[PDB]
Symmetry: T
Subunit: 170 residues, 12 copies
Amino acid sequence: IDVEKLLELLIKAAAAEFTTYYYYTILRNHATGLEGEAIKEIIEDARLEDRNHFEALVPRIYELGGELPRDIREFADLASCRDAYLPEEPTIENILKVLLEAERCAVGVYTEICNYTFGKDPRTYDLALAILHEEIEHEAWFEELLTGKPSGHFRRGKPGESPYVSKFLK
Amino acid sequence: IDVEKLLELLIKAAAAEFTTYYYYTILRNHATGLEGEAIKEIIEDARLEDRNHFEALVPRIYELGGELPRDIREFADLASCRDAYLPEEPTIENILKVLLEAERCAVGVYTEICNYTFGKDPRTYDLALAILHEEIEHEAWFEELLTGKPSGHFRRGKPGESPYVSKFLK
Amino acid sequence: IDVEKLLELLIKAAAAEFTTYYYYTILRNHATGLEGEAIKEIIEDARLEDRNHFEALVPRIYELGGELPRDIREFADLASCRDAYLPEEPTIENILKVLLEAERCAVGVYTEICNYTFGKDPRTYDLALAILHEEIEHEAWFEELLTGKPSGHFRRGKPGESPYVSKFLK
Amino acid sequence: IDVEKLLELLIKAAAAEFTTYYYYTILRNHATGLEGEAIKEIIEDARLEDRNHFEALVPRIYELGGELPRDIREFADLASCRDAYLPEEPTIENILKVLLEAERCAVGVYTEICNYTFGKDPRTYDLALAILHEEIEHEAWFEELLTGKPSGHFRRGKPGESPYVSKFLK
Amino acid sequence: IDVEKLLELLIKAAAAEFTTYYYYTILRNHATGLEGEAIKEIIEDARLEDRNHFEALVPRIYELGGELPRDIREFADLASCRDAYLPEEPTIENILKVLLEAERCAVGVYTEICNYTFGKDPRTYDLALAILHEEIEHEAWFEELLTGKPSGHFRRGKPGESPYVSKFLK
Amino acid sequence: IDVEKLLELLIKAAAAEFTTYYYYTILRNHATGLEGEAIKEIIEDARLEDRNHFEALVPRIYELGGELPRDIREFADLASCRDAYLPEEPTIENILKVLLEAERCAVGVYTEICNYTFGKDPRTYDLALAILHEEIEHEAWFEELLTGKPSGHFRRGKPGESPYVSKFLK
Amino acid sequence: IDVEKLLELLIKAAAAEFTTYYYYTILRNHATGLEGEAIKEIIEDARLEDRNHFEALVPRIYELGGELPRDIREFADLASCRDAYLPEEPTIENILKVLLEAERCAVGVYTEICNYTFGKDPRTYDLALAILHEEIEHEAWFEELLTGKPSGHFRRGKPGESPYVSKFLK
Amino acid sequence: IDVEKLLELLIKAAAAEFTTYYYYTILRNHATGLEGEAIKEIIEDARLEDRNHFEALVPRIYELGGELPRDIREFADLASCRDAYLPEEPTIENILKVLLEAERCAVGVYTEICNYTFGKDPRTYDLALAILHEEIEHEAWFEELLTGKPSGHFRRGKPGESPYVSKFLK
Amino acid sequence: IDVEKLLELLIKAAAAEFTTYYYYTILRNHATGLEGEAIKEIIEDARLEDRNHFEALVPRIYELGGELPRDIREFADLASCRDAYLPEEPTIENILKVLLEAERCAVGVYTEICNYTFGKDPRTYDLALAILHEEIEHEAWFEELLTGKPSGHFRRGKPGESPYVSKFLK
Amino acid sequence: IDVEKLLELLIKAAAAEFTTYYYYTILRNHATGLEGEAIKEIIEDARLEDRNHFEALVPRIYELGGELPRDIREFADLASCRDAYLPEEPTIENILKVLLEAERCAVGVYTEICNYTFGKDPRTYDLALAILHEEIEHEAWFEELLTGKPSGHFRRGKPGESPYVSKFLK
Amino acid sequence: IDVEKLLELLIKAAAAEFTTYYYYTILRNHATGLEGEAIKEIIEDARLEDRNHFEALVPRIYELGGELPRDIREFADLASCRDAYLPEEPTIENILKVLLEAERCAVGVYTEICNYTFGKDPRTYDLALAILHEEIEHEAWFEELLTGKPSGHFRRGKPGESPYVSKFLK
Amino acid sequence: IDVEKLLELLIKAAAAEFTTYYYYTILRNHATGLEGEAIKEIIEDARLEDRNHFEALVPRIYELGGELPRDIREFADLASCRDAYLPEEPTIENILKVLLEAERCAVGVYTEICNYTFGKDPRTYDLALAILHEEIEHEAWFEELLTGKPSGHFRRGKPGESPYVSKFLK
Ligand SMILES: [Fe+3]
Ligand SMILES: [Fe+3]
Ligand SMILES: [Fe+3]
Ligand SMILES: [Fe+3]
Ligand SMILES: [Fe+3]
Ligand SMILES: [Fe+3]
Ligand SMILES: [Fe+3]
Ligand SMILES: [Fe+3]
């Protein structure tokens, strides 16, 4: 396994989690009205779990001999998912589209890391898998809200509980 | 009081609670979209309390010298309420109709047991009354969601808390 | 500072909180249907925090040498906000209008008390400010639900937690 | 059973609980001095449990198709117990007399509802019985404090815990 | 209803609960060996719940204008169940026989009180019913251990939790 | 050390604790009125800790090869303190006199056991000392209430917490 | 990976967990007598964890685009383990044989799913592995009770805690 | 603002809090008898909150570049309130007089600091205000106990909870 | 008061808190070795409280009709404190210098907001003051670690507890 | 007192506790079958408390200027009790014999230390006494299981709680 | 035993604990810099436990018929340990020297009380022993920090937990 | 997979964990002085987690049909890591070297087991991975303390929490 390549993947993933923490704050605040009130708590759970994902990734990056970039702007520019901007027409549907696209990119990111580390870096694989669990659940949430396809999920107990990633958190 | 007749009522009630636990799982998963997100937690609270009702009824059945049927299929066929099938057109309204009809049947079932045991089997009466409390609240929930008639209820704290039946639970 | 004038303001504020506790009970029970299910918990949090506000104001009234009026009807007639009656056409929108108008009046009431006591009665100012915090949040809640303007708030953890007024509560 | 008559009883009971919540606030604040310090916590427990009784009665009123009156003054005028006014000579003994008379009226109110619903409305009977438990304990408290007749009770753990009515509370 | 007769029943019941608390201490300590280790915790749960039953009955006795007898020996002599003496051959089977006989007598005692107070003394009926719940469960426990007839029960969580009588306890 | 003599002391002590549990129940219920309300919780803490003392002594009696007497009447007759009867004139002062005399006898009982076991039976000494701690505090409580001599104590947090004996309790 | 084949495996596994929840209820209730008292809590822990396994599998089935069958009878007929019927001679040994056979089938079921998803469906693999952990422990429990071969396990803290599957539960 | 003058005020206030912690220990221990039992817990809550006030003031003194005096005697001599000596005739009334006078001095001390720092030292102002809240409540307590004027307060939950100063405590 | 100017101050403050959350992550990870082990937990508490400060500021920004900038890079560029870069020679002393300079800038930022809103925007003033409390404590921490001047502080209980800002957090 | 001799006793005791932690692991795992299921939790409580005893002894050894031996084999060879080997015929009875013999040796060890330190080394005496409490209870447990002599004990709440030694544990 | 002599010892000990509470506050605040950050929490634990020691000693002084001196200065002058002044050169080493000397004096004080009360005043002996436990641990802490001799201790969980004295605390 | 070879690996790993529990006790006690105070808690967390690792490995060894060796000396001799002896010159640096070498050996041990069981023994692989997580974190801790290379970790909340292995613990 190429630790330099792995470190780039992990840093790009951490950048996506960090920027998502900011952009989902904006999206949550624009999920207004009666229909917005349904999804506001769901966005908040996704936002806080993505913050947890950033917190879980940074120790592994440093364990592997990597480091966060010096400038926060450099870091944001490394994000492996495009920025989850507030849509120009911020309807609930358009916001859900942004959220679903972001979660689908995240699922792809950690699937790629899991594929890269499978049977080679057990600790990193297990960390990527833990985050992948939560991203798959996020993607299921938003896909159901947007398309009506049954996801099998309903409200998390308290936002940001991160049941799969918690063992990596301090 | 005819313990054999009482046992049949209790077993039929337990069968209805058990099957409801399965069928409400399906119904919860098809309460999708923005409007489904409102009622998903309400279905879940009803589903988990009906599981509690099954757990509360079984000890009383055995205390009275009865027993569950040998085969799970026999048991399901004994249910005193018709199966809460997913409707062919699973809109939120059609799902609510199934839920309301099921809860109304449950209210009838425990009202019948309470009438049968009033002043004759205090422990069984109190158990039937405890479940009846929760069924009346479930029926109120779904009737309000479906017809807009004020029920007087809003979200339970945590799903499955069963405030009335808890003293019967282990 | 004129303690007699201050006492009248505080008693009128306490009357508004007390009557709101009653009228919001009615409003919560008529927020029915799928769209009502969104706002029912929000009304309940506002109702329980306004009950807390009454509980926090009464000790200060007595500390300052005032007292509640002898008759509950006299007390209700002193309310500094007009009664939050159920609207003749109790749609969710019309209910939200009543709630928003009540919260806006409350914000005005405690802003007036804060202005009257600023730099003169520190304990009363701090109490009025604590309640003002919660009224501003209530007003933000309902204004977002009604107009879609981003308020920055989403569901309180448990209704009636009163994070700002709790230090005044027993 | 005549649901209209039952609803009137329940609303009148709820009015008595609501007004008691106000009037006991006044009574608690005038139970002063060394001897008042004994009974202040007892009044407070009674006051908070009567608030719980109001909270428990309202859902049942709405379940049965009733509603609270539009105006808080109408509601107060419906109270089935006369107003627990602060006595003109507010000695501890005179305050205890008011409290005992109020609790005795409450015991009568819920005894009447229990008699009306016995074997006919199990849920309402059980609710009336739950409140009756707490009223009988309140009456015992104050009768002992006033006459020295042994009641068998001593301080509740925390005021407002409502051990009998809690299962009806949210 | 004849309060004097009711008081005698309640005092005799309280005496049985009090003496059982002592005699079950002896029985628990003689349930030795590998087979005794099974039932020791079951005896302990029964013993502590019977202590709770004594604690729950005394306030009601005093509420009704009765009192405990002056001398503890008088009290013990009033017990409505014969003393649960350690058997002359204290085998596990012989101990279980004593326990089952005691619980069957207790079930009879509270069934008699429930019959006497049904529809006449709601608070006392509810107290007798609460204790009856726990006695029926105790009788089921020991009957299963002794005869193998399925009771439907297994270990209580913590001994002395008294799920049915707790609302009467301080 | 003479284990037979030690066992007699321990059984007589356990009998005193057991009977006190009964007699203090009566005394607590007759500590009525405004002045009784002060000491009711203090009696209750003493009563529940003396119940704990009985629970702590019985295992040690059995560890040492002793056993409780077969009949509860035999047991009560062994009490090392005379019965704490309700006084013929049950004033608060006369009740306090009974309580103080009982606690003084208890202090003497465990002082005697500590003297007998000092440097010879460490486990029994430590158990007697643990109970002695609580008896000395009880005696201080009642002596202050009766004579005004400063004891240095004020209300225990929750009655029956037994801070010194808890390590011996299950 | 063939999602249709995977879905069939998962649904058949969920059916086995669901039916086990019923059949283990019967088995627990027939584990009577002194020797049954040992294993009753062990059956109960297995039963509640198998209920948790059903709850954990259903969301994954829906995430993958599958659904539970319409009728509860269809569902039961899909179970990948034969029904754990009460044996015709329900001795403790014969009951243990049924339990061990059921757990061995479960171990086989999740081993097959893990083999099918290894390195291909990380989330499903991790879910199957989590359940496999608990099935291997169940099989160890019952094999030790039946054959005396050391399993390395002793009583779970509280039944149904599911330490391995909890992260999948809501 | 003159930090040297402010530091002197804060150190003198801290000295008063520290010495009060000692002197209220004496006063609590001499609040004996039946009437003393009422106020003992109130003195204890005041004593522990004044200890908290000392703990809250010291960090601010050091933050501002001040320090506690080298010798504890120097420190005690700086107290801004005269020593709360046990009165020569330590009746409950005379003790209450000492307590009320001490609390009135404390209210004056923190009112002076609040006036000195208003709009100039926000952190110190907020700290002085937090302590002032608790001193005003203490003064209300003792004034009611002594004169019967309604204060609006009753027993704090647990002594020393310091609801207003807690945010400054570690 | 000029809400546009106030909004710019608040957004610039929120940007500083957000970027600090990133940069302190880097600084914490480079506080290595035996001497670094002392300050690592202190950096972590500062980092998590600054994250809390961002979370507390955003709702107020939206309440006042402002919004976060569309792009995370725009946001970072608005920070009112220069970026807390890892020093080119990352010794513990040089890291402490960066931390102290950042905290001093933060103290200045919230002092400016408090000055701008004093007596004009009570809610915003109280929020700025709450954050100012924590920044003053952070500055004290690092100044003591760097210069040895007594600050009066020692380790926070758990990192990120934010005792002053918590009432603003969800 | 001869600290060198005392240190040897304490180190030999710590060695016995440490080795017991290992050997009881083996014994617990071989207490199989239906009869083994009774005693498995009892062995586990003894094993975890003996681990606690090792943890409590080591600080005292170092306080007195002693140290653990360099090599773990040297340490094991110092054990004051012979190794609790799995018996060649590992029946439940033979295992109980090993356990009882080990506990009897432990009781002797701490009795010797208590005798050596009585009135000379209070801290060490109190530590030895604390462990002696738990060893006497362990010996009682196993003696009852093996011989049927009443011990007075039944299941500890949670294994390893060490109620007597806890004050020495970190 | 001479209670007057014992009272003088106890009061002198309480004075030392009280003054230490003040002087250790100063010492903690001057344990600055990177090396001071290690010992600051250790000083704080010692300081809070010595406050607990004062709280534990005062009730015993009053139980024995003693009393605290009228003036706080008299009290401080009675301290059995010389004042733990901040050293003229307040280096970490010089501060540790003061702390170690103070703890050594405390160990001597309670060793003297234990010697005086051994086998004569069990309650006082046990109290002195409880404090002696904590003083020996404090002395071990500081001696290790100062000289490097292994003490066997590391950080207490939370400062002021007083595991040995807690049973004497309210 | 060769279960005999796997069992040898697991037993050798368990031996290393067991001996580490002893040797880290010695190392922790010799990490003295101001610089030792930093790492003492880190050693303690590693020591308690390695004890947890032993507890987690033993059930798996028995599940697979293996057993611990008869004699504790045989067991210690099987350790897969050389004994972590206290260095002849026990400086903090030399102690850290021993700790780092031990953790590096542990990382190698569980990496080997993971490699051996990957895709063949899922339960054992997951157990080895869980321990590997904690060993990698331990190695990171000590490497940072020794070399200054950023590890990304700071103090665990409470020592011995084992966030990754907890699901395997009872
Ligand atoms: Fe994420
Ligand atoms: Fe309000
Ligand atoms: Fe009421
Ligand atoms: Fe006692
Ligand atoms: Fe399963
Ligand atoms: Fe103060
Ligand atoms: Fe900040
Ligand atoms: Fe001390």
